[PDB]
Design a protein around this nucleic acid. Sequence first.
DNA 1: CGGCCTACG
DNA 2: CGTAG
DNA 3: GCCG
Length: 325
Amino acid sequence: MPAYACQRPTPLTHHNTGLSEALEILAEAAGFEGSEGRLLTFCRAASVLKALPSPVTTLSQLQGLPHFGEHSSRVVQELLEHGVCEEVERVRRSERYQTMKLFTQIFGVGVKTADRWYREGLRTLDDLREQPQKLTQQQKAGLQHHQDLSTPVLRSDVDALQQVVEEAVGQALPGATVTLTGGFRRGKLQGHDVDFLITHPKEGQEAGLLPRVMCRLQDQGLILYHQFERSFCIFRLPQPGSWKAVRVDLVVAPVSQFPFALLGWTGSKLFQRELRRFSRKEKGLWLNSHGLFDPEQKTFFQAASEEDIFRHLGLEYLPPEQRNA
DNA sequence: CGGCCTACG
DNA sequence: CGTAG
DNA sequence: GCCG
Ligand SMILES: [Mn+2]
Ligand SMILES: [Mn+2]
Ligand SMILES: [Mn+2]
Ligand SMILES: [Mn+2]
Ligand SMILES: [Mn+2]
Ligand SMILES: [Mn+2]
Ligand SMILES: [Mn+2]
Ligand code: NA
């Protein structure tokens, strides 16, 4: 089992769901306390389990697995023995964890804001709604739409959104294309938002495109909020006899950068952090969603496909459905 | 030990 | 500060 | 918290 998540296939569904979920609770809690290192280890340990070919039944099976030390092994051992891990359950029912989770789920609120509100004594959404003067416009939008934004986005929703985005893109720039990215491109059947990547086959024609797309969506009455090359929107999506708010991300890239942006925006988040870590630490190359840089020769790699990028980095190709680290 | 991804709004 | 995978 |  290789040590980096980008070196192994990770399918969406797997054979250690309960164990991975417990470790991801501890990862999330570490993040709420500002410990990114512990968050990463627990996330990586969870991802290792997702990549295994069968269920872990006995502690012996963790021997030699990367990112399993005394702490993560004890969590698994307790789950195997007792069906529950006392530490995990303590986190789950803690006021700190529950409140940090509720607040950080709000669009516009991160760990730092949530933590300060927690220290001020705030605990519920209505607590925040009682003094709206201190909220940002982004936070006001996230709070007003929080209930809708908590309901899973379905595949049917995605197909409907893509058609309306394509119509606005077509008027903004004939020939421009729309690609579904994020978790739905990895095969997820539900999600918290929809991610789209927009380009044009003629290099440079995409310049200035996103403002033109947003204006046309806004004049169609589809934009509840927005909020350049990345737009974090809230869309009004029709429903049977009504509608619901849905988070949509629209991102533009020139065709020269499209493979890097496609790779980055398809994720998973952990997969891309690991891929960038692998690139720099093992290959001496600097990767982002714009390109791949050799700092020794001071040159950018040209890529025409995701396959090109995996080849550049010396990695076996993984389709999106195997990037669910 | 130091590192832990790397951007844009 | 927030956002993204 | 773990690696390397
Ligand atoms: Mn410990
Ligand atoms: Mn026991
Ligand atoms: Mn997404
Ligand atoms: Mn998104
Ligand atoms: Mn750019
Ligand atoms: Mn240290
Ligand atoms: Mn996200
Ligand atoms: Na948030």
